[PDB]
Amino acid sequence: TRQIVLDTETTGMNQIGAHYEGHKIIEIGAVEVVNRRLTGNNFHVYLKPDRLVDPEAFGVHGIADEFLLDKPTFAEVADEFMDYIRGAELVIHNAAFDIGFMDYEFSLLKRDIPKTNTFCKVTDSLAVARKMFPGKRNSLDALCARYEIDNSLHGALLDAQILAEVYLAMTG
Amino acid sequence: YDWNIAAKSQEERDKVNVDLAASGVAYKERLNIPVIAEQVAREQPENLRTYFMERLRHYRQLSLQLPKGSDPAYQ
Ligand SMILES: Cc1cn([C@H]2C[C@H](O)[C@@H](COP(=O)(O)O)O2)c(=O)[nH]c1=O
Ligand SMILES: [Mn+2]
Ligand SMILES: [Mn+2]
């Protein structure tokens, strides 16, 4: 088997209701792990949304609308993206967020693509962290502080690499 | 063919990051978010500052195709 530690950046999210509705993925970052080792077979893409980035979202990832204009759309990278993760165990911090966004984008392609959970094992590192450290703060930053990992703007690929180190530490 | 950025040249990937910073400055100027452009250029690898300045000019032009911070879109 193989594990893909993944993260995404978006145009934002809804405080109420379906968190992804009307928003878009603008960055996908993922790093492969096999036998607890970073293989180097990574995936990274920026995507052109059909809308503006919420200022708040920009506050988190620093990905500008100007930067996304010449980038491919989700439809254009869809298959290359699926080929890459298919069959692997996806490790995502608060998996519900990204999986919801991923399935949302796939559904927009109108290709009857099945739910990500049907062709990938989905592991929620936030759930793993909560079982491991109940009653504690388990955000990615808190976990980094816990494991004394130094990381002196967020990014999908960056957040994936960081989550990979954190997850390895958590499961070591 | 392949869009995967991770599969590209280190130089190419380095360029993408400078682009991210450059476009970021233009973005802030458009949304009226304080930013000191000169400080950011400094933060970039010396052998790429020339690239940063050109990309900054480039992205500032693209900014004109987008709404200003004072426009309805951001109301
Ligand atoms: C932390 C945070 C994330 N987001 C959205 C935009 C981010 O690109 C996306 C993923 O965040 P994350 O990688 O920290 O989980 O969630 C917000 O809209 N507001 C926030 O305060
Ligand atoms: Mn995330
Ligand atoms: Mn992130």
Structural domains in chain B, sorted by start: 1-75 (1.20.58.250)
Report the alpha-carbon distance of residue A151 to residue B6 in Å, rounded. 20
Instruction: Looking at A55-132, list the stretches that DSSP marks H as alpha helix, in order from N- to C-terminal side.
Output: 55-61, 65-68, 74-85, 95-108, 125-132
Report the alpha-carbon distance of residue B37 to residue A73 in Å, rounded. 29
Whether B23 sits inside 8 A of A76 (CB atoms) is no
Count of CB atoms within 10 A of residue B61's CB? 10
Residue B59 Cα to chain centre, angstroms: 6
For residue B52, which of B66, B64, B40 has the smallest C-alpha distance? B40
Which ligand 1 atom is at minimum distance from the Cα of A97? 15
Rg (C-alpha) for chain A, rounded Å, is 16
The answer to whether A81 touches A45, Cβ cutoff 8 Å, is yes
Q: Which of A10, A14, A51, A124 to mutate to test the pocket of ligand 1 (most atoms within 8 A of CB)?
A: A10
Domain of residue A110 covers 1-172
3-state secondary structure of A74: helix
Report the alpha-carbon distance of residue A123 to residue A4 in Å, rounded. 10
Domain count, chain A: 1
Q: How far is B28 from chain A (nearest CA, A)?
A: 9
For residue A53, which of B69, B13, B6, B15 has the smallest C-alpha distance? B69
Return the CATH number at A83.
3.30.420.10
Q: How far is B60 from chain A (nearest CA, A)?
A: 8
